[PDB]
Design an enzyme around this catalytic site. Sequence first.
Site, PDB file in Angstrom:
ATOM      1  N   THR A   7     -46.265  62.875  95.540  1.00  0.00           N
ATOM      2  CA  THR A   7     -47.261  62.044  94.879  1.00  0.00           C
ATOM      3  C   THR A   7     -46.665  60.693  94.530  1.00  0.00           C
ATOM      4  O   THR A   7     -47.366  59.683  94.517  1.00  0.00           O
ATOM      5  CB  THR A   7     -47.767  62.705  93.600  1.00  0.00           C
ATOM      6  OG1 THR A   7     -48.416  63.927  93.943  1.00  0.00           O
ATOM      7  CG2 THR A   7     -48.763  61.802  92.879  1.00  0.00           C
ATOM      8  N   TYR A  21     -55.582  62.233  94.594  1.00  0.00           N
ATOM      9  CA  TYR A  21     -54.894  61.279  95.453  1.00  0.00           C
ATOM     10  C   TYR A  21     -54.449  61.940  96.750  1.00  0.00           C
ATOM     11  O   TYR A  21     -54.595  63.145  96.930  1.00  0.00           O
ATOM     12  CB  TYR A  21     -53.647  60.759  94.745  1.00  0.00           C
ATOM     13  CG  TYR A  21     -52.686  61.888  94.480  1.00  0.00           C
ATOM     14  CD1 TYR A  21     -52.737  62.611  93.286  1.00  0.00           C
ATOM     15  CD2 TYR A  21     -51.827  62.333  95.485  1.00  0.00           C
ATOM     16  CE1 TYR A  21     -51.967  63.747  93.109  1.00  0.00           C
ATOM     17  CE2 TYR A  21     -51.065  63.464  95.321  1.00  0.00           C
ATOM     18  CZ  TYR A  21     -51.144  64.166  94.137  1.00  0.00           C
ATOM     19  OH  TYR A  21     -50.432  65.320  94.025  1.00  0.00           O
ATOM     20  N   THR A  23     -43.842  67.028  93.264  1.00  0.00           N
ATOM     21  CA  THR A  23     -43.595  67.903  92.125  1.00  0.00           C
ATOM     22  C   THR A  23     -44.027  69.375  92.241  1.00  0.00           C
ATOM     23  O   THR A  23     -43.538  70.212  91.492  1.00  0.00           O
ATOM     24  CB  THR A  23     -44.256  67.342  90.857  1.00  0.00           C
ATOM     25  OG1 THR A  23     -45.672  67.507  90.965  1.00  0.00           O
ATOM     26  CG2 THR A  23     -43.936  65.853  90.688  1.00  0.00           C
ATOM     27  N   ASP A  24     -44.924  69.702  93.165  1.00  0.00           N
ATOM     28  CA  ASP A  24     -45.395  71.086  93.268  1.00  0.00           C
ATOM     29  C   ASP A  24     -44.281  72.120  93.536  1.00  0.00           C
ATOM     30  O   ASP A  24     -44.295  73.204  92.957  1.00  0.00           O
ATOM     31  CB  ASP A  24     -46.515  71.187  94.319  1.00  0.00           C
ATOM     32  CG  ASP A  24     -47.807  70.491  93.874  1.00  0.00           C
ATOM     33  OD1 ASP A  24     -48.745  70.375  94.691  1.00  0.00           O
ATOM     34  OD2 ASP A  24     -47.897  70.065  92.705  1.00  0.00           O
ATOM     35  N   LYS A  56     -42.314  73.260  86.745  1.00  0.00           N
ATOM     36  CA  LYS A  56     -43.573  72.563  86.517  1.00  0.00           C
ATOM     37  C   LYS A  56     -44.387  73.582  85.724  1.00  0.00           C
ATOM     38  O   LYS A  56     -44.858  74.569  86.287  1.00  0.00           O
ATOM     39  CB  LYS A  56     -44.276  72.241  87.842  1.00  0.00           C
ATOM     40  CG  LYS A  56     -45.461  71.296  87.685  1.00  0.00           C
ATOM     41  CD  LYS A  56     -45.949  70.758  89.035  1.00  0.00           C
ATOM     42  CE  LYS A  56     -47.075  69.743  88.852  1.00  0.00           C
ATOM     43  NZ  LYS A  56     -47.616  69.228  90.148  1.00  0.00           N
ATOM     44  N   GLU A 110     -37.767  98.231  81.523  1.00  0.00           N
ATOM     45  CA  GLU A 110     -39.073  98.719  81.959  1.00  0.00           C
ATOM     46  C   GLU A 110     -39.031  99.684  83.144  1.00  0.00           C
ATOM     47  O   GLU A 110     -39.950 100.487  83.327  1.00  0.00           O
ATOM     48  CB  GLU A 110     -39.983  97.539  82.313  1.00  0.00           C
ATOM     49  CG  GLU A 110     -40.637  96.874  81.114  1.00  0.00           C
ATOM     50  CD  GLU A 110     -41.651  97.778  80.436  1.00  0.00           C
ATOM     51  OE1 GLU A 110     -42.265  97.342  79.441  1.00  0.00           O
ATOM     52  OE2 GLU A 110     -41.840  98.923  80.900  1.00  0.00           O
TER      53      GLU A 110
HETATM   54  C1  CAB Z   1     -43.994  97.482  75.622  1.00  0.00           C
HETATM   55  C2  CAB Z   1     -43.761  96.092  75.093  1.00  0.00           C
HETATM   56  O1  CAB Z   1     -44.946  95.529  74.477  1.00  0.00           O
HETATM   57  C3  CAB Z   1     -45.189  97.103  76.469  1.00  0.00           C
HETATM   58  C4  CAB Z   1     -45.845  98.007  77.471  1.00  0.00           C
HETATM   59  N1  CAB Z   1     -45.056  98.349  78.665  1.00  0.00           N
HETATM   60  C5  CAB Z   1     -47.299  98.289  77.727  1.00  0.00           C
HETATM   61  O2  CAB Z   1     -48.062  97.418  78.109  1.00  0.00           O
HETATM   62  O3  CAB Z   1     -47.707  99.542  77.551  1.00  0.00           O
HETATM   63  C1  CAB Z   2     -48.990  65.249  93.630  1.00  0.00           C
HETATM   64  C2  CAB Z   2     -48.959  65.221  92.129  1.00  0.00           C
HETATM   65  O1  CAB Z   2     -47.906  65.211  91.515  1.00  0.00           O
HETATM   66  C3  CAB Z   2     -48.126  66.365  94.180  1.00  0.00           C
HETATM   67  C4  CAB Z   2     -48.453  66.729  95.607  1.00  0.00           C
HETATM   68  N1  CAB Z   2     -49.319  67.853  95.999  1.00  0.00           N
HETATM   69  C5  CAB Z   2     -47.073  66.936  96.165  1.00  0.00           C
HETATM   70  O2  CAB Z   2     -46.277  67.694  95.636  1.00  0.00           O
HETATM   71  O3  CAB Z   2     -46.770  66.280  97.282  1.00  0.00           O
END
Ligand code: CAB
Ligand code: CAB
Lengths: 330, 330, 330, 330
Positions: free
Chosen positions: A13, A27, A93-94, A166, A287
Site C-alpha cells: 500500500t 486503493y 502490511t497484510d 497486524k 489442553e
Molecule cells: C478451561 C479454561 O477456561 C477452558 C475449557 N477448556 C473449556 O472451554 O471447557
Molecule cells: C494495503 C493497506 O495497507 C495493503 C495491501 N493489500 C498490501 O498488503 O499490499
Amino acid sequence: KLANVVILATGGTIAGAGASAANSATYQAAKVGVDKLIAGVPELADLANVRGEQVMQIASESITNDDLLKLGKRVAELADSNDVDGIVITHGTDTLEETAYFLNLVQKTDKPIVVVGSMRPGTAMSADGMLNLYNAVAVASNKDSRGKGVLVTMNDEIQSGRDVSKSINIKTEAFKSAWGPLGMVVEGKSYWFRLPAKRHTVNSEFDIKQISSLPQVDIAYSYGNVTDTAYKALAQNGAKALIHAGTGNGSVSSRVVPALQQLRKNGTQIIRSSHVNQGGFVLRNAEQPDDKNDWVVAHDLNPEKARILAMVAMTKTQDSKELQRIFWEY
Amino acid sequence: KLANVVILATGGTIAGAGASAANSATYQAAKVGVDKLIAGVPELADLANVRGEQVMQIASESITNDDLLKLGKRVAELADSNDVDGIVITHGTDTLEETAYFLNLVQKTDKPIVVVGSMRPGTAMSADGMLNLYNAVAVASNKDSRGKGVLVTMNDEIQSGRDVSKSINIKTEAFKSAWGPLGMVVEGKSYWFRLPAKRHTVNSEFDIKQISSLPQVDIAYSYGNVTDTAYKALAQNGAKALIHAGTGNGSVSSRVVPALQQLRKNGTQIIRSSHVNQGGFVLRNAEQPDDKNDWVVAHDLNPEKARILAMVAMTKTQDSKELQRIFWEY
Amino acid sequence: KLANVVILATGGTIAGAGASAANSATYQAAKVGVDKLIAGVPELADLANVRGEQVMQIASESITNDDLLKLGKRVAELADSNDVDGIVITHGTDTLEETAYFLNLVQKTDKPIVVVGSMRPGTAMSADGMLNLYNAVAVASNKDSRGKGVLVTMNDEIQSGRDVSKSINIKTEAFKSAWGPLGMVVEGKSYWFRLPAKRHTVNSEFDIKQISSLPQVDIAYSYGNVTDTAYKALAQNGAKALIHAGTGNGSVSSRVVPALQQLRKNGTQIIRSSHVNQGGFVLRNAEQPDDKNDWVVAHDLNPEKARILAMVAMTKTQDSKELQRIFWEY
Amino acid sequence: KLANVVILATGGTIAGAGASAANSATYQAAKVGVDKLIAGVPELADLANVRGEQVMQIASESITNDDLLKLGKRVAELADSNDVDGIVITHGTDTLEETAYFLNLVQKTDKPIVVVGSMRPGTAMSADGMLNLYNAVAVASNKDSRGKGVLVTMNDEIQSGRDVSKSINIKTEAFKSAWGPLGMVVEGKSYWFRLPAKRHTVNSEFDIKQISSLPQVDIAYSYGNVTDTAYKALAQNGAKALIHAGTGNGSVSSRVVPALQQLRKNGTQIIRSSHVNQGGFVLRNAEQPDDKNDWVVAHDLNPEKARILAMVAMTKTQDSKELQRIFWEY
Ligand SMILES: *[C@](*)(C=O)C[C@H](N)C(=O)O
Ligand SMILES: *[C@](*)(C=O)C[C@H](N)C(=O)O
Ligand SMILES: *[C@](*)(C=O)C[C@H](N)C(=O)O
Ligand SMILES: *[C@](*)(C=O)C[C@H](N)C(=O)O
C-alpha cells in the site's frame, strides 16, 4: 561520512494509489516504483546515502514462498557487501509480520534490517507512508540498531519483527506486539527501552544460503462444530506440517483429535497455536497430551508466525522434540 | 423480594479440576456439577434465590450446533416463565464468545442473560470462578440489566456478548472487546458507562422458537502462500457459507479469488472477515469488488463471530444483499 | 442539499508549524489561521457547506477558564441558529479532553459537536491533521451523529468527549478511552458500535447560558512521602474544590488525611480521583470513609476530567451528596 | 538443593482483610503477618526453602522516604549473605511501582529481587495473592532470573520494576508497562521474551550502601487554568527538585513558565514529565527550550517514577546536564 542504506521495494500500500485524497482504505496496491517513493521524501538525503531497488511489485496478500526466498537471498547478498550498512524493505502490511519474522530467522548478519509499509496509500490526505519510510531509514542508519534482529518501524515505534503483528485494521497503529515495542523513533532519533530475548539473525542456527525451497505448511482454523475436514484436505494435498489455530490454549475438539493422531502417525507435524493472539501463550501438555501424541506447541506465536518458524525449522529437522525446542527459543 | 435467578450449567473450567492447587492452566474441565458450584458460593443467597440446572457437562472446545440449539431453546423456556427474573449460564471460555453472540441474536426477551466462565479451575489457588459467578448473579438480579442484551461477567467487567472475545490466554483478563466494556461490577453493584448500539434480543428479527436447525458454515484461514484447497474441501463437505479469515482488510490472495468466484456461483455464500481482531473492521468493496462478485463483508466480527451470525441469518435469507444488511446491523 | 457545518478554530498543533518536514514532535503551535486549514483540504466541499471562524489562537496547555466560556457561549449561539447543522472545533490536543468534556456538560443541543486536533504539525511529512479534519466534518455532517453528545475524531475513530483522554505521547493513536471508541469513520462513512450511557448535552441539568464564571478548582498529586503542602496552598489561594489524584483507588496518605478533614470543614470540597487512569474507577468508602468525612469520589474520571465536572456542578450545588450523584451520572 | 529465598513483608492488601468474602475492593490493609502468609501457601516448600521477616506493617499509600531507606538497606544486607539466593518483598500495590524502581536503581546485586502484591485481600473469594506469591518465589528461585534487575510478578507476568505501573484500578491486571512484560510465569516455570535495556542493579552507578538520606522531591500537576501556586509552595517547603506532570509532551502553561525559571535560578531542578502515561515519552527541547532554561526531561517515566530517579540521582550530582544523561540511561 553518512551510512549507505539500500531500500528493497516489494510493492504494498505504501506504493499504492487511491481514487481521491479522501480514499484512505480503498486503493490499488503496488502501483508506485521505488524511485518515486524515494523522491517523495527529500529529507532522506540528510539521514544516509540511499539507493533503491525494485525486487518485485505485489500486494503482499498474494505473496508466495518463492517470493520470500528471492527476497531473503537478495538481502543476504546486500548484507555481504562491505558497501552496505543498512537495509530497508518496503512491504505490504497484510503479510509483513510473516516476512519480517522469516528474515529474523535466516539472515545471519548484525546489520540493521528494517521492514516498513503504510496503512494509507501515498495519495490519501495525512498518508502515513512518508514518515514511516523516513523513520525506517533513520533506524537502518543508526549504529545502535545493530544486533537487534529484524525491526519494523511504523507509528513512531521500533517493533521486533519476531512478534509484531497486524492487530488493528484501518488505523495507523495497526501493528502491536504482546510484549511491547523495543523503542521509538522521533525526529530522526532512536530511543530504546527493551531488548530482544529470543534467538535471531547472527545467533540463529538457520541460514538462507543453505535453503533451496521451503516445505509446505498450512493452517486450519478451529471453532464450534469444527470437523476434521480442513486438516485432512490440507495434509492430503502436500502439507508437511499443519498449524492448528485452536480456541483458547490451543484446545482441540474431541471430534478432531483422532484425525490429528492419525495424521501424526502418517508423518505430518501437528503444531498447536491459537486464535487468542493479544497475549499469553500455548502451554505444552495443558489442553492436550502433547508428549503422548508427539505434537508441538507454538508457545506465543500466532498461526501465521508459527507457520513461518515451522517451515524454516523443517529444513534442518523433522524431530518433534527438536521442533519444540526451536519453538521455545525463537 | 429477591429476584429469582436460574443457573444453567454447561461445564467448562469453572467446573474443572486440577491435579494441585498450583495448577492454574493444566487441568481437566467439566468435572463439577452445578450444585457443587452454587454451594461453593454461600453469599449468593444474599443476591437472590438461585436454583441450578445441569444442562450438559462438556468442554466448550467440543461444542456442537445441536448443543447450541438445545441450550438456546432451554433459555427461551425459562425466560417465558414468570418465576424467572434472570438467567446465568456457566460456559467454558474457549467458545463462550460464540454461544454468547448466538443467544444475543435469538433470545427474544428483555430479561438479563449472563454468560460466565473462569480461566482457572476451582482447585487452583486464587481461582477466579467464585467472584465471577457471584457477579454474574449480581448482574442477572439487577433491574438495570434488562434490555441490554446478553452479558458476560468476568474480570469485574460487564462485557457485551456480541463482541467480547477471548483475546488473551492464561491471564484472567482474557476477554476483551474492541469497543470496550459496557460497565463494571464491584461488591455486588453494577456501574454502567456505555450502551449497546447493535440489534439484539427483543429487537432481533430472529427467534430461537422458529429455528429447528442451523445451516453448516465453516471457516478458512488466509496467509502467505495459501491455496484454495481448504476453501473447496469445506464446500465439498456441505458448507453453505464460508468465512474467509483474510489478512489485513479481509484481503484475498489472487490465487484464491477464482475458486471463491466459482464457489459463489455454485451457491456458497462468501463472507470476508479477518485475523486482525484487536480493532477496526472489514470495509465493503475496499480490498475486493464485493458488489461485482456478490460477496459479503463481516464488518467488525472476528471469524468465529461471523460464523454465528451467518448461520442464524441463513435460516431466514440467502440473498447476499440482505445478508450484508444483517452484518451491518447486528 | 448539503449540511452547513461551522469550524471554530482555537489554535493547537493542527494549526502549528515545524522547522522541517521531518519535525513531527518539535513545532510551534497556533501559527495557522482557520481559512488556511480549510484550503488545505479541498475535498471538504464534498462533505458539507463549510465556513470557518477563528475564535482564538492559542496552544491549549495555556488555556484559561475564560477561554472555555468564550468558546462555550459561542458554540451555544451557533447551535441556536437554524442555519447551522454541525459544529467542528479544532483544538490543541494537550487539554482537548478537558474542553470536549466541558462542552458535553453545558451545551443543551442535539446537533453534532466535534472536537479535533493533530499530533503532528501540518508541515510534517505524513501529518495527521488533514484526514482528522476531513473526518471531523464528515461526522458533523452526518444525521446519525445527532444526540450522541460531544465527539472527538482522530486516528479514524469516533470517541466520546466524556472519557477520551490523551494517553499516549508522540503517536497518532494518542487518544484512548477506558470504555472504548463509539465507532469509526472511514472514507467519509460513520460506523457505530456503541452508545453513550452517561447524561450529556440535551439531557444535562447544566446550561452554558446560565453560567457567568467558573469556581476555582485545583488538583494535587499524591505519591510516596507526599505531604499536605500542595493541598493547603491551593485552598488558601482560592480553590473551592480540590481534586485529590491519589495512588491506586483514590488512596490518601495518613499524613494528609488531617489536612483534608480540616479543609472539608472549612468549606472546601474534597474529590478523590487517582493517577491510575487506564481503567477501573474509584469506589466510594473503599479506601477512605467518604460518608464520615463527607468527601466525594470521582468514579472513573481522571484528575483533569474530575476538575471539569466539579467546576460545572458547583455552579448549581455545593451539597456533597448532590455532587456525588452528579459524579455518578455524568 | 533448593534455593534459599527470604520473604520481606511490608504490608499491603496481600496482607489485608475484608469484612466478607464478597469484599474484593473494600478492605483494611496490613493486618496479616508474614508467617500467616507463607503458611497459606504450602506448595511454597516445593519451590524452595523460605523464611519470612516482617520489616513493617503499613499501607503503601502512607510510605515515607525513611521506610524506603530502611527497606533498601535490609535488602542489601540479605543479598550480601551467601545463605540467600533470592529475595521476595510483599508490598502494597498503590506505591509498589515506586519502591520497585528505587531498588532497581540502588541494589548492586545480580541476585533476583521480586516485588509482589495483590489487588484483592486474602479474605475475598478468588483472591489473587496466593498465586502471585507462589510465582514470586518461583521466579526468585530461578537462576535465569539473575541479572534481569528488579522484577514484579502479578497476573501471571514477569514485569520490569523500572517501568511497570499500576494503570488499572480494581482489576487484577492492574499493572502494565508501555514496553510490555519481560515474560510470564506459569505453573512454576518462567518464560522469557524480552530483556531490559536500561541500566539497573549491578551496572548502576548508585549504591544504597553509600546513601544515608534522600533529598526532598515533590510533584506538581498541570492542567487547564493551572497557576504557579503549587509549584512555589512546594519549593518554599524544601523541594530540591520539582516533577512537572504536564499535559501532552511535558507542556508548561505560559502562566507558569516564569515561576519555573525563577525557581531554577534559585537552585530547584525542574523535571518535565507528564500525565500521558500509556506510552511515548517527553522529548527534550520540543515543547519548551530545556537547554536555554537548563531544565530536565523525564523521558518515558511517569511522575512518581521520575521522582524516584531524581531523588537517587541528586545524592550524587546537581548538574542538570548529568541529570539529563541519567534520565536517558536509567
Ligand atoms: C478451561 C479454561 O477456561 C477452558 C475449557 N477448556 C473449556 O472451554 O471447557
Ligand atoms: C494495503 C493497506 O495497507 C495493503 C495491501 N493489500 C498490501 O498488503 O499490499
Ligand atoms: C501540539 C501537539 O499536538 C499540541 C500543543 N502544545 C497544543 O496543544 O497547542
Ligand atoms: C490494597 C489494594 O492493593 C492496596 C493498599 N491500600 C496498599 O498499598 O497497602
